Amino acid sequence: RNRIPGRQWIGKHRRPRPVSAQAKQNMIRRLETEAENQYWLSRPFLTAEQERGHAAVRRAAAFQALKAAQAARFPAHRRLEEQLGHLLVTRKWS
């Protein structure tokens, strides 16, 4: 008897839905975690210049491994045991 015009949640006229004490709690708890979050982000150990190149040795190494892993891709070895081993299909008792 009291219709919501058009589609429920979309248009110029929407279903009114209210904010719940639950929702306020949840949102606030998130906020608290974030405030703490940006407390711990506030004081670095090293300064900006103290970390320059501080590990550049590891980073280059990693990339050398990444490269090396790809360079190794080649068709696999083929062995006699395969092509010959196929004959085992017809093996018998006699």
Binding site: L88, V89, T90, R91, K92, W93, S94
Partner: protein
């Protein structure tokens, strides 16, 4: 599906494992072809493994028949009377071995849905709840509006 098929409660045959454990698998019958390739694995299994298997399980009698068949089968048969058929057709030695083991360690009960994971006779030690168990008794044992 579960409404589709039959079902059973969890049980043992003859209360196995209570007094002592009895391996339920009774006999094992292989049928294979000396010639046919389909039976290849089954032949190798008979060569190497069967012998050792027979020592590892003294209580099961193993009948091996070479015959002209296209589809090697193994027929497990249990103390329960239960007969379970299998096809070893076109498998490794390894596969067959694993299969024969499954057969060795099964109860012979039918494989269907099992209604619940536990089976207890006398679950109830120290009582079984009834509507009165937690209710206080009154003086004279009168009902709510009863007068004396």
């Amino acid at each position: 599906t579960a409404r589709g098929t039959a079902s059973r409660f969890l049980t043992s045959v003859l209360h196995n494992g209570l007094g002592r454990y009895v391996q339920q698998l009774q006999r094992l019958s292989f049928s294979l072809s000396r010639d046919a390739p389909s039976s290849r694995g089954a032949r190798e299994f008979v060569e190497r493994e069967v012998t050792d298997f027979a020592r590892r399980n003294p209580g099961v009698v193993i009948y091996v028949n070479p015959r002209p068949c296209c589809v090697p089968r193994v027929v497990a048969e249990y103390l329960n009377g239960a007969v379970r058929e299998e096809s070893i057709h076109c498998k490794s030695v390894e596969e067959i071995a694993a299969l024969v083991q499954k057969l060795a360690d099964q109860s012979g009960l039918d494989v269907i849905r099992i209604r619940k994971p536990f089976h207890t006779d006398s679950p109830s030690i120290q009582g079984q709840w009834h509507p009165f168990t937690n209710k206080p008794t009154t003086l004279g044992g009168l009902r709510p509006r009863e007068v004396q």
